């Protein structure tokens, strides 16, 4: 996809992550497990809700056919009426189908962007205190217990705190 994360450098999705669209899998001495990122999921959920409403709302004063009848001496007028009502029908079917395609495209890319941005947020916070494995995972140069993992996941990871220990381990 456009942002290269979904079905990209993160090769597959997680059946085990059931409480949101995007998030984490962590592995340490204490154990391993999945957790959704609440903030990015909520942000995407609100965007998507707004999108569906917007697409629906723009086709609310859409054309309506109105039944009329015509004599055998009013065939041109009958045809005009038919071409008009059918013409608008075709325009609005076009508006609906095109809009749904164009927006579906952008929806899938939006999720891709959201995953990429989440990855990059974590990456830009962890810096060289970790190895980038290239598959969506980071390997730590310092032990990162459950509280440490929680700080990464809520965006309050303390680089300076682990800077000393990580650089010694990276180099030894």
């Amino acid at each position: 996809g456009l942002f290269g994360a979904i079905a990209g450098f993160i090769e597959g999705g997680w059946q085990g992550m059931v409480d949101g669209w995007y998030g984490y899998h962590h592995s340490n001495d204490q154990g391993s497990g999945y957790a959704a990122d609440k903030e990015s999921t909520q942000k995407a959920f609100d965007g998507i809700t707004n999108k569906v409403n917007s697409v629906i709302e723009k086709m609310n004063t859409q054309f309506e056919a109105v039944g009329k009848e015509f004599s055998n001496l009013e065939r041109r007028l009958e045809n005009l009426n038919k071409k008009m009502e059918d013409g608008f029908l075709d325009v609005w079917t076009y508006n609906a189908e095109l809009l749904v395609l164009m927006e579906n495209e952008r929806t899938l890319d939006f999720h891709d962007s959201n995953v990429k941005n989440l990855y990059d947020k974590v990456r830009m916070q962890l810096r060289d205190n970790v190895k980038e494995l290239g598959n969506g995972c980071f390997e730590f140069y310092h032990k990162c217990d459950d509280e440490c993992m929680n700080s990464v996941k809520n965006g309050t990871y303390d680089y300076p705190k682990y800077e000393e220990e990580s650089k010694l381990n990276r180099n030894e």
């Binding site: 079905a7 999705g13 997680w14 669209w21 001495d29 029908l89 075709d90 929806t107 995953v115």
Partner: protein, 324 residues
């Protein structure tokens, strides 16, 4: 090898598919179908108000009072009108109805009439009013449209027939009249006595007249003659004057417009069922919260918007990607 954290995304068992500009048939984790494709196959009351079911009667058959349409002589307020494609019971005495489609269009904004006896038949004291035709037979005897009066000779005379009505009813009133075009001179003489007759109608705005046409025509319902009907909407406080030396088919009644609003004539061969809807189509009623439907373009009520689409599905979730 040390502790790890990984970034990822949701997958599930979803088989829901969507299209984009760039790619077709994409499986997504979540999707929203926004197109209603179903209906109940029934004609229903619309918000509790039943349609007017004409059965085998046409709009003309109803308003003229074709005797086959007597169930319709007094009808309550309706939400829409059901008319068959080719109703059997229309002009039983054959003829034509001027501006008939304009009259049907008027009905798309009318939800009730009060039929008012504007020109009581008993007041035609100088003319015969019992005239009828085998084309309109009831119980094997000649009869006639119930709402109309066929004036003929009395005591072998037909004096100028004059009737007038001032619309004091409180609303605009639909009034229909006709001219009889006989088949032959025998008919004209035996019915009217006079020759070179006319029918004149006049309001403040309308002045329409007719000279009856005697001429041989193919028989329709047994008759080579024709009745040519015309109509007007008589404004509040306006007067209509009928004047004729022969061949006038006079109204006895007018239809006061007693309720106005969005309505319509639905073309259907079906019959009303004991069901309720907010949205009626000719194929059946729709009950949905979805914004679009593809059932039929001619709907009555509070309906979704019609599109020709076979599918309209919005992706909401992400590309559903096989686990590793």
């Amino acid at each position: 090898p040390g502790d790890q954290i990984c970034i990822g995304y949701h997958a599930n068992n979803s088989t829901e598919k969507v299209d984009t500009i760039l790619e077709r048939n994409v499986t997504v984790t979540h999707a929203k179908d926004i197109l209603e494709k179903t209906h109940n196959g029934k004609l229903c009351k619309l918000n509790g108000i039943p349609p007017l079911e004409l059965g085998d009667c046409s709009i003309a058959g109803w308003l003229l009072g074709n005797p086959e349409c007597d169930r319709l002589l007094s009808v309550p307020e309706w939400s829409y009108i059901m008319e068959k494609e080719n109703p059997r019971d229309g002009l039983c005495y054959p003829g034509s109805f001027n501006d008939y489609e304009e009259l049907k269009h008027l009905l798309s904004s009318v939800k009730h009439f009060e039929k008012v006896k504007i020109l009581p038949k008993d007041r035609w004291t100088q003319h015969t009013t019992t005239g009828g035709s085998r084309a309109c037979a009831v119980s094997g005897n000649p009869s006639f449209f119930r709402n109309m009066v066929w004036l003929t000779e009395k005591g072998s005379n037909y004096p100028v027939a004059k009737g007038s009505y001032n619309n004091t009813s409180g609303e605009q009133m639909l009034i229909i009249w006709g001219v009889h075009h006989p088949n032959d001179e025998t008919e004209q003489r035996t019915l009217y006595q006079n020759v070179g007759t006319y029918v004149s109608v006049g309001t403040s705005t309308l002045n329409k007249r007719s000279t009856p046409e005697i001429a041989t025509r193919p028989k329709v319902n047994g008759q080579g003659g024709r009745m040519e009907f015309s109509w007007t909407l008589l404004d509040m406080w306006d007067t209509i004057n009928f004047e004729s030396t022969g061949n006038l088919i006079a109204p006895e009644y007018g239809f006061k417009i007693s309720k106005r609003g969005s309505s319509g004539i639905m073309k259907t061969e079906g019959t009303l069922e004991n069901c309720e809807t907010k949205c009626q189509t000719p194929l059946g009623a729709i009950n949905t919260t979805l914004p679009f439907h593809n059932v039929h373009p001619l709907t009555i009520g509070e309906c979704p918007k019609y599109v020709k689409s076979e599918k309209l599905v919005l992706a909401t979730g992400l590309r559903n990607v096989p686990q590793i």
